[PDB]
Amino acid sequence: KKAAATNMSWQTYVDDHLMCDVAGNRLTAAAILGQDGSVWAQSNNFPQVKPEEIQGIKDDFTTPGTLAPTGLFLGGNKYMVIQGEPNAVIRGKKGAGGVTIKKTTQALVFGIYDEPMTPGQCNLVVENLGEYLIESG
């Protein structure tokens, strides 16, 4: 019955809650884009995402398996699609690194890790914060 749904600043969500130091290491880069493709907040070194890349990501959330055969692209870098959560989470691999994308009510959470950060740690900070944004909208 209690909405009570507040909203911190977008950059503080990325600066404090996405690049937060986890077990000594942090994400390589992170960003939060609205589902329209607009960049609402991004890290200092997050790559510029092409709309054709954004268009495909929405297409695999609505239809899992779209980006899997061809691969997932972010700013010219190719990420191999790995086990993700249908319609909610897309996960990728690029060598010792990878990427986790969490779908929200109206936005998209991006998180990019490299060595030595583990894929589960990137999945941790992305899905949980995205799950919190799911709870609030």
Side-chain angles (χ1 to χ4, degrees), residues 1-105 107-137:
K1 70 231 74 181
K2 53 264 196 178
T6 58
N7 54 249
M8 216 177 193
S9 99
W10 277 123
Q11 199 59 57
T12 325
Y13 279 117
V14 174
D15 297 347
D16 297 359
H17 300 91
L18 283 176
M19 310 297 280
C20 65
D21 187 277
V22 175
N25 36 77
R26 72 202 308 103
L27 283 180
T28 302
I32 295 170
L33 283 68
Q35 293 175 22
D36 66 347
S38 54
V39 176
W40 294 350
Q42 67 164 55
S43 64
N44 45 307
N45 289 323
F46 189 81
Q48 179 48 47
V49 187
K50 305 170 187 299
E52 63 226 80
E53 297 173 335
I54 296 161
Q55 204 62 252
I57 291 170
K58 291 195 292 186
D59 294 334
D60 191 58
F61 280 131
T62 188
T63 46
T66 284
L67 284 169
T70 86
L72 156 70
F73 293 89
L74 285 186
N77 304 277
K78 182 174 178 177
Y79 293 86
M80 173 205 248
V81 175
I82 56 183
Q83 190 137 342
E85 223 149 272
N87 310 106
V89 178
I90 291 174
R91 292 189 192 93
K93 252 279 199 177
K94 185 195 217 303
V99 60
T100 307
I101 310 171
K102 170 69 163 182
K103 184 180 171 186
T104 76
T105 53
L108 299 174
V109 186
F110 285 74
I112 296 164
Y113 72 93
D114 280 294
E115 64 215 302
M117 187 170 183
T118 71
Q121 289 164 344
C122 176
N123 295 343
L124 200 85
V125 315
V126 170
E127 303 174 26
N128 281 18
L129 170 57
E131 192 74 337
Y132 163 63
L133 298 172
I134 284 175
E135 278 171 42
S136 321

